[PDB]
Design a protein around this ligand. Structure first.
Ligand SMILES: [Mg+2]
Ligand SMILES: [Mg+2]
Ligand SMILES: [Mg+2]
Ligand SMILES: [Mg+2]
Ligand SMILES: [Mg+2]
Ligand SMILES: [Mg+2]
Ligand SMILES: [Mg+2]
Ligand SMILES: [Mg+2]
Ligand SMILES: [Mg+2]
Ligand SMILES: [Mg+2]
Ligand SMILES: [Mg+2]
Ligand SMILES: [Mg+2]
Ligand SMILES: [Mg+2]
Ligand SMILES: [Mg+2]
Ligand SMILES: [Mg+2]
Ligand SMILES: [Mg+2]
Ligand SMILES: [Mg+2]
Ligand SMILES: [Mg+2]
Ligand SMILES: [Mg+2]
Ligand SMILES: [Mg+2]
Ligand SMILES: [Mg+2]
Ligand SMILES: [Mg+2]
Ligand SMILES: [Mg+2]
Ligand SMILES: [Mg+2]
Ligand SMILES: [Mg+2]
Ligand SMILES: [Mg+2]
Ligand SMILES: [Mg+2]
Ligand SMILES: [Mg+2]
Ligand SMILES: [Mg+2]
Ligand SMILES: [Mg+2]
Ligand SMILES: [Mg+2]
Ligand SMILES: [Mg+2]
Ligand SMILES: [Mg+2]
Ligand SMILES: [Mg+2]
Ligand SMILES: [Mg+2]
Ligand SMILES: [Mg+2]
Ligand SMILES: [Mg+2]
Ligand SMILES: [Mg+2]
Ligand SMILES: [Mg+2]
Ligand SMILES: [Mg+2]
Ligand SMILES: [Mg+2]
Ligand SMILES: [Mg+2]
Ligand SMILES: [Mg+2]
Ligand SMILES: [Mg+2]
Ligand SMILES: [Mg+2]
Ligand SMILES: [Mg+2]
Ligand SMILES: [Mg+2]
Ligand SMILES: [Mg+2]
Ligand SMILES: [Mg+2]
Ligand SMILES: [Mg+2]
Ligand SMILES: [Mg+2]
Ligand SMILES: [Mg+2]
Ligand SMILES: [Mg+2]
Lengths: 205, 151, 262
RNA sequence: CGCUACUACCGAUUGGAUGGUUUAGUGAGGCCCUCGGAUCGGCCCCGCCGGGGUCGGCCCACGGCCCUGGCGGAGCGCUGA
RNA sequence: UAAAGUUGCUGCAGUUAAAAAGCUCGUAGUUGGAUCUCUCUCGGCCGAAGCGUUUACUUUGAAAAAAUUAGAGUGUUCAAAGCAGGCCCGAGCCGCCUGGAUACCGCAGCUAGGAAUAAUGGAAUAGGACCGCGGUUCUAUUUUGUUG
RNA sequence: UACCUGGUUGAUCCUGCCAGUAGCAUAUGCUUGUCUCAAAGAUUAAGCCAUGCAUGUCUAAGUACGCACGGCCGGUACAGUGAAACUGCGAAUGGCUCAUUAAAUCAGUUAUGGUUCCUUUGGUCGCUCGUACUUGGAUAACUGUGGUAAUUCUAGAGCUAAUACAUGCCGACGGGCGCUGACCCCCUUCGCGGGGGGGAUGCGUGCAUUUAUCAGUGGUGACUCUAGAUAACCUCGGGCCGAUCGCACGCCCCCCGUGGCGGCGACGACCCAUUCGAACGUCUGCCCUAUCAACUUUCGAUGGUAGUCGCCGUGCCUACCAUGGUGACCACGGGUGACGGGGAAUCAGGGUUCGAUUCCGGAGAGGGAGCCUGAGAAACGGCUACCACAUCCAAGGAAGGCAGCAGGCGCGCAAAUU
């Protein structure tokens, strides 16, 4: 079938070579796993040595890490925005390694509000729900309030991430290969890389 | 700016450049810590690799490659590909019947790191063996020494 | 081939087995085990060709299936079991103990030992690595893995193992002045004292050895096995003390023995 | 130049021939993906046969609550293959 | 295959027997005149580190499948072969002694000495060696009994 | 054994071939008494095959209610031998041939710090804090009913097992450690404030898997190595954490029990190490041919970036890019009565020729191609198609691969017993 050998290629000088053996089992190849966005659907593949490869065909969730805060959380995947290799992958919404995607921001906001006890992602209208009020304005003792006030010194986030939190969606990059391991894992974009990808996305439109 | 020329972001994989810090340390300098390593066998790391800002995953000093095998030498003949040059190795082959020799040559495509600059055609290069980096490249430039006509 | 090979041609067998050409087409292919195929001695070869206990391969099986032979204190019924360097073979039925040691000709010799000596063996440290939970592990030349070794033991050293419990009793460090035997190459079977070690980064190291009579030679680092500390070995030696004679002096010794015979 | 024979060359022309390439147009079969659902079960709703406890009016009769073995019929109810 | 010094590297011919281009220039190739008599530091005289401007050459050493060839031993009745065999027995009823060597293995790649021959190298717009002395900028470790 | 002789002329000296001489290996002719070894359908046809055989396997230790045999008790599960069948393993080794193949194969030398690995050997296997005195449904062999001209074709019905197929606990289990932390104390302070402890209640936890971050036990010439810490994840086509078998059977208790404990093995299993390998790489090395001088790049040719696929490294493939790469030191193309070496014949010293052939590598099973199972095959004494041949038929269908051992046809100068 699909063979990824080296003897069907031309030589360095440019002349062609005559093969001396037919296709072998260990030189085989398999059709690509075009992973889309939807309810989870994964097929297992029996590979050389008796091992398994998890061929993810459909994925909708994955665990992403906020590196600056070191906060890893499991969040759903919403859409694909940018792809360096080819723009056809963006149109068909294919999940591959190093593609830029949009993920939900709710678990990160919950962790941030439970850690620093500061508002985040809230509108200027100051509308609130009592659960969030008791999460932020809880009655703490002197020692615990002392730790929280000290934590409030380091509570500061760049304007780009704050705007993304206001929008409700974050930009992330996938670091795992969905077609090989069956899961879509990655990290939240931030810093110079976030600016680079924002500029690329804006220029694409 | 000058480094970012591809559709994908060019980063050093082992360096985390998004570590948050106080506003006082941000004003000082935005100097990313450089990743480099000693390749061994007595070869020294060029200062341009340590102090440089280029990104090259195939660089023997700042990339993810391993130097093991044979260490060979050649003369630079062509510099027209991106980050890779063509060198020529000359030798003599012995013919038993006539008790004499004949001149022979080989051509090698080797990877040249951005840390090595001011490399001209006709200077000596010491290369080391690594894993296959492309279809025809299996060696990486380790040292560059100038020609006899250097002033 | 499409997979592992299961046969061994008799002419393609190792030459230190001293097999003859006209007996058959095949030779006993050693089973997988602690020792390499080219560096072991199969149980059948030692049991019928060296000791002359059996005449055919069937009698070797009839002996082995009575659970008479023990290798390193454990009963082996496989007739092609790979037995290698510094191994102990015990036959309780006849009350005999043997240790596999190369002679000066590079062949395994029938070397009888005291039953007291048959309780331990020497091993060469091949690998040192830290495993899960920060537990050191030591891997010897005969595939033995030992947990929690002495922190001073490094690679190329020698450890004494008690065959009953399989635990280290003591060890010898790889230093100049110790006693070593060559386990491979042109100097296989020679015993001497280490003189100096040459280090070649990225390549093989070369070690020089000098014997009792003053003859010097060199080998690679992988072919050296440390036997004893200083000039005193920790095991019993074969008839030849590890000194290789030249052809002229072997002829002289043979002629002297013939003259004194009769 | 006139006789007698052979080999090798041209060259009206088209046959018996095969072999090797490729341009285009079809294309068996396996494998992968998206569908598909012949059929086979398990769980709920009733009915009558059977064994363990208990509750109730109680005296060797009959119901309640659970389990438990089989059997017959529904639900395009649910689910698995 | 030798004979064939009738394919000539050793080692052939080219005036008249077959043969030197009509003549000249010229790139690649081949070839090329003489000359030049180990080192500080750090550690225990040696150990580490730089060696060598580098090679070519020669002499060592290591790694290099068996079988074949060469070759040691051995009365297969000799030999071609084979890797066998020999000794005393009053019987050893624990039988004894001994072999299964060695040489060679081209080229390329490793290792350590030699320094003749043959290549290559330095100080000429001296921004060349060696011993020192001031001026400025950028970072790391330790000592002020610890911690800022 | 470092070797020559006849032939051109009326006669001579030469150049120069022809012929003469000796080995070796194929055939053939004549002849042939005794013994020891010993090649043998390679050359033309990798052309075609009747027939027969060439791969099967059970221990005390997975499953026996076949009287098919068999000893005693006679409900008192199973005495023993054991056909058949389910399960497990092997069948990827060996044997044959040399068609293809010219930096390809192959040889020496290195590398995997860029991968996989049945089995053997050794190491782990209460390290997880959350019906068990043993859980469930079927299937053969067997007993009965059948279909087809025909096969190692199978269909229905009635039974019954597991180390087949599934499902699932207890125990260790007392806690420990990370975060959350109401509340309770102890110092200084007139007091706020500055400190030091204890803590109920909640979440997480072991090894493997995926991602992100932090610090820097042991090792290398060199890791983005090994080990450690932190936040999470952990695939229903699902990683581990034993519902398995045999032999000898014994010590203990407030006891006669739900009795508790215990020795050797067999089988199985996640993960390391080892063994047997396999697979991709580095350097050097191959016969003739210019009446083959430029080749490669539309359809990847050379390199870069990111991905896909793959067991891994890589134009292996994809997208976007640069214009590269090779060549009189002979590229590219063509031929080879070319599988490559270890080797063989002849040889003063050089050298010439051969190597299908018992050893080591490679390739193939009429020619192509695609696959299932499995640790390992693009397997052919496995399967599925096309191409060419070809067997039985009741014309509806079914079954093929001797370059395995014999043997047969054909081919030829040329090669053995069903
Ligand atoms: Mg082929
Ligand atoms: Mg010569
Ligand atoms: Mg085979
Ligand atoms: Mg075997
Ligand atoms: Mg199709
Ligand atoms: Mg000749
Ligand atoms: Mg001659
Ligand atoms: Mg001639
Ligand atoms: Mg001469
Ligand atoms: Mg002549
Ligand atoms: Mg003339
Ligand atoms: Mg002239
Ligand atoms: Mg010239
Ligand atoms: Mg000169
Ligand atoms: Mg060899
Ligand atoms: Mg040899
Ligand atoms: Mg005459
Ligand atoms: Mg002649
Ligand atoms: Mg007679
Ligand atoms: Mg034939
Ligand atoms: Mg043939
Ligand atoms: Mg034959
Ligand atoms: Mg056969
Ligand atoms: Mg079976
Ligand atoms: Mg199998
Ligand atoms: Mg045969
Ligand atoms: Mg090789
Ligand atoms: Mg790899
Ligand atoms: Mg294994
Ligand atoms: Mg049935
Ligand atoms: Mg099972
Ligand atoms: Mg780690
Ligand atoms: Mg890549
Ligand atoms: Mg690329
Ligand atoms: Mg040949
Ligand atoms: Mg051929
Ligand atoms: Mg000669
Ligand atoms: Mg001669
Ligand atoms: Mg040959
Ligand atoms: Mg051959
Ligand atoms: Mg042929
Ligand atoms: Mg094949
Ligand atoms: Mg065949
Ligand atoms: Mg055929
Ligand atoms: Mg076929
Ligand atoms: Mg298997
Ligand atoms: Mg096939
Ligand atoms: Mg066959
Ligand atoms: Mg076969
Ligand atoms: Mg036949
Ligand atoms: Mg047949
Ligand atoms: Mg004949
Ligand atoms: Mg005939």
């Amino acid at each position: 079938g699909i063979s990824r050998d080296n003897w069907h290629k031309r030589r360095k000088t440019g002349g062609k070579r005559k093969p001396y053996h037919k296709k072998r089992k260990y030189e085989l190849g398999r059709p690509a796993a075009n992973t889309k966005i939807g309810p989870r659907r994964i097929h297992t593949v029996r590979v050389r040595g008796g091992n398994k490869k998890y061929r993810a065909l459909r994925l909708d969730v994955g665990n992403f890490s906020w590196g600056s805060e070191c906060c890893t959380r499991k969040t759903r995947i919403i859409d694909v925005v940018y792809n360096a290799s080819n723009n056809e992958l963006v149109r068909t919404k294919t999940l591959v390694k190093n593609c830029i995607v949009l993920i939900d921001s709710t678990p990160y906001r919950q962790w941030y509000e439970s850690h620093y006890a500061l508002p985040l992602g809230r509108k200027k209208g100051a509308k609130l729900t009592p659960e969030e009020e008791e999460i932020l304005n809880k009655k703490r003792s002197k020692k615990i309030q002392k730790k929280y006030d000290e934590r409030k010194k380091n509570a500061k986030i760049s304007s780009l991430l704050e705007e993304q939190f206001q929008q409700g969606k974050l930009l992330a990059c996938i670091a795992s290969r969905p077609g090989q391991c069956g899961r879509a894992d990655g990290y939240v974009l931030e810093g110079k890389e976030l600016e680079f990808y924002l500029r690329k996305i804006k220029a694409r439109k | 700016a000058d480094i970012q020329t591809e559709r994908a972001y060019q980063k050093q994989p082992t360096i985390f450049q998004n570590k948050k810090r106080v506003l006082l340390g941000e004003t000082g300098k935005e100097k990313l810590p450089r990743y480099y390593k000693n390749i061994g066998l007595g070869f020294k790391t060029p200062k341009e690799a340590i102090e440089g800002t280029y990104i090259d995953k195939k660089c023997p000093f700042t990339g993810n490659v391993s130097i093991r095998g044979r260490i060979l030498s050649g003369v630079v003949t062509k510099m027209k590909m991106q980050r890779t040059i063509v060198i020529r190795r000359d030798y003599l082959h012995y013919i038993r019947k006539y008790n004499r020799f004949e001149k022979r040559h080989k051509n090698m495509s080797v990877h040249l790191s951005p840390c090595f600059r001011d490399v001209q055609i006709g200077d000596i290069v010491t290369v080391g063996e690594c894993r296959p980096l492309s279809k025809t490249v299996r060696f990486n430039v380790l040292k560059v020494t100038k020609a006899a006509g250097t002033k | 081939a499409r997979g592992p090979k299961k046969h061994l041609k008799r002419v393609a067998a190792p030459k230190h087995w001293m097999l003859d050409k006209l007996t058959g087409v095949f030779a006993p292919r050693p089973s997988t085990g602690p020792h390499k195929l080219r560096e072991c001695l199969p149980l059948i070869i030692f049991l019928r060709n060296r000791l002359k206990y059996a005449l055919t391969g069937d009698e070797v099986k009839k002996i082995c299936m009575q659970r008479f032979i023990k290798i390193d204190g454990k009963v082996r019924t496989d007739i092609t079991y790979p037995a290698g360097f510094m191994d102990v073979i015990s036959i309780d039925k006849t009350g005999e103990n043997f240790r596999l040691i190369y002679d000066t000709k590079g062949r395994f010799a029938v070397h009888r030992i005291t039953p007291e000596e048959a309780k331990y063996k020497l091993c060469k440290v091949r690998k040192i690595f830290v495993g899960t939970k920060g537990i050191p592990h030591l891997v010897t030349h005969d595939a033995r893995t030992i947990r929690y070794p002495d922190p001073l033991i490094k690679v190329n050293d020698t450890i004494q193992i008690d065959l009953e419990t399989g635990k280290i009793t003591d060890f010898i460090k790889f230093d100049t002045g110790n006693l070593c035997m060559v386990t491979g190459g042109a100097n296989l079977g020679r015993i001497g004292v280490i003189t100096n070690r040459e280090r070649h980064p990225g390549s093989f190291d070369v070690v020089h050895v000098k014997d009792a009579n003053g003859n010097s030679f060199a080998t690679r680092l992988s072919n050296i096995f440390v036997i004893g500390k200083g000039n005193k070995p920790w095991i019993s030696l074969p008839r030849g003390k590890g000194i290789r004679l030249t052809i002229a002096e072997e002829r002289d010794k043979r002629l002297a023995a013939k003259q004194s015979s009769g």
